[PDB]
């Protein structure tokens, strides 16, 4: 839908009558396009930085660290077009306190019960207790 | 291999052109190096959801009514139709992209250990004498 510049373009900062094509993820804006039909000069991000979406940033962003205070571990290294992917160690599930904040917790075992649902990436083990004992929080 | 964000020109291997952005398709390759690629916005009812060099836009998808799916977001030039399920129905994925909507179980003779989620049925906790077989609490013994 409607924009000043065509889809995929931005307005030249030095000239409002010219629209330049944006940079793709993995690259940053090295120089604005020199005119309407010219290409924007986009260069690939240096190792240790990235741009995860189409953009016209004059710098790439530094790759993020996983939050050690949250028990996080890097599960996927940062590439020019994608930031560090963080997760938890095996047998641990992520508990999201918010959309972007999660803490790693140890998957529960089923003492006096039996695993109804195995521990998932973002969900603790779901236990169903044996005859006699009852479910109470994380323990039967 | 052309630089990040570029694709090899079809008529000239010496030339690498900048890819088109989501929401646009390739109308004309770049005339030469340093020249813009001619990419144009998709017509209403079509989209391209990522960087590309596709010479056509793709037709917007229709949510699967047979699967109980409902449209939770309309198709735009840069994003296809987003489908989901009505409140109290969860998604059961048959495959990577195909999902079907199913009623969220009410825990009969059990207790809602876990309430129904977008991609997970209600989890039940049966009662004395009743053991859960499937998503339900059946009479004991077997």
Swiss-Prot record, chain A:
Residues 2-140 are extracellular. This is Tumor necrosis factor-binding protein 1. The gene is TNFRSF1A. Disulfide bonds join 5-19, 20-33, 23-42, 45-60, 63-78, 66-86, 88-104, 107-119, 110-127, 129-140. TNFR-Cys repeats lie at residues 4-43, 44-86, 87-127. Glycans are attached at residues 15, 106, 112.
